[PDB]
Amino acid sequence: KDLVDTTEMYLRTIYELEEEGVTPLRARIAERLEQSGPTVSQTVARMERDGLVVVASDRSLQMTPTGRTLATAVMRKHRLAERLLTDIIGLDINKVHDEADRWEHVMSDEVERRLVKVLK
Amino acid sequence: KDLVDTTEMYLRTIYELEEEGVTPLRARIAERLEQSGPTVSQTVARMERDGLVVVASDRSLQMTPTGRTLATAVMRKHRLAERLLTDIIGLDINKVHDEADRWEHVMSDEVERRLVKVLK
Amino acid sequence: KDLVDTTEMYLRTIYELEEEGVTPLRARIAERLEQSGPTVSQTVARMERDGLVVVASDRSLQMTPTGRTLATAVMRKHRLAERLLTDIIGLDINKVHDEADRWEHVMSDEVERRLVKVLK
Amino acid sequence: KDLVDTTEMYLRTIYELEEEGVTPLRARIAERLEQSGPTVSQTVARMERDGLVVVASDRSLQMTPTGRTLATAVMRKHRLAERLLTDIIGLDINKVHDEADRWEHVMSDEVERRLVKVLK
């Protein structure tokens, strides 16, 4: 719905946290994604069950090999979308990332590869 | 979501059905979106509740002004999307409808306008 | 529903038909279990899918070994119920079969054996 | 079919819950009949629709006259079955409640009465 796909926006949010140094904590995801505290815990749990993440003893989020995989793919697509929007389509900059947060969840690998060549 | 957005695809199915000049019946949506007979009626219901369609006395689906407005909208983005993918991106033509059936539900109005221009 | 357990009541009706040497046909089950002809064919279909029956070239029902097994167990419990109600409980003789038509479907094998000692 | 009769088992659960002094909450039915949260809400609603219960303002389940009448009946046949099984049929005392949990939904008043008499 809002997130088009939750697991992906959760995986991306975690990855983005690690990227900026911040400890990947559920409380963070909650605030970053505008969702309630127990909602996040529940979903993360669901994801842990699905073998995407793991909660550590220090309560930090640890992505599994499969987790990262999916994570870097959404990140990838996010950029690739953001580019296509700003250049080829030429959408208002202040609206770009907003658009890409959605397209990122519905862009196939096929197009992904295709698009990397196209942009250039 | 398999349909990304269920309501937009139920509307597009009705509209397209109408173009083909085939009475729009739930059993028809059923075949096309591959869902159980019960699931379709249950959904058309929520839909009729939010006033997007009306189930006639002869069981045909009648889109309300709102329903028709959205339908055209979705339908319009579908084409602009199918286009964007073939013209500038260049993706295997055989995989273009499917991709566009996903993009149709995440494309913003602004991106719809900026796209009618860019493409020539 | 009314039949408590359709598959069981179908298997028994077939077996009973065979017992009285009458071609076991769907139109025959419809007659006895008082259900619409399309309903009967659909259900039998499901049963065939479940490896309980097979519909021959002449369109007669043919219980598979797993099917006859089920069939005899139902039939067997039906008798043990009809007896328990008449001998021990002493329920009105007319109302006896109707009651047993239900208990037949909800009596464990466990209880079956026991009742075969007590009852006689 | 897992409950044999879904409505009769909801009443009984509400009823038994009241005997134990536990507030009859939908969540309680879920725990006990082991069903999904959303499944219990539907079923109760359907029940409320046919006026067998009323969801209080503090969310408690209020059995209506009709509902309680049924409840008791069920509750009554449960015990009669439980005895009949353990007293004249002599079945594993351990496996008696379960067996009774099924018989309760298929026992006639006609038989209920005959049973109270034929058990000294």
Added chain:
DNA sequence: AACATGCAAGGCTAAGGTTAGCCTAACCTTAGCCTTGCATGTT
């Protein structure tokens, strides 16, 4: 005396629904529960 049509059962299938039951993924609110870091007035 053998023919013919003349179809009507009888037995299904094709279509399109409906109810009752059940389920998961996501979200929410309202209540506590542990740690921690320390402000604050105290010896």
Added chain:
DNA sequence: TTAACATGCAAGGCTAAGGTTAGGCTAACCTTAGCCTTGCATG
């Protein structure tokens, strides 16, 4: 004339508990409509 001092307690981060919507599904049933293959009964 301030180091030295528990320790008082609100954040911060969760879990607990009970729901809700949206979206899906299967088993069982129904009515209508149409199709096909014989068992006769009338010219």
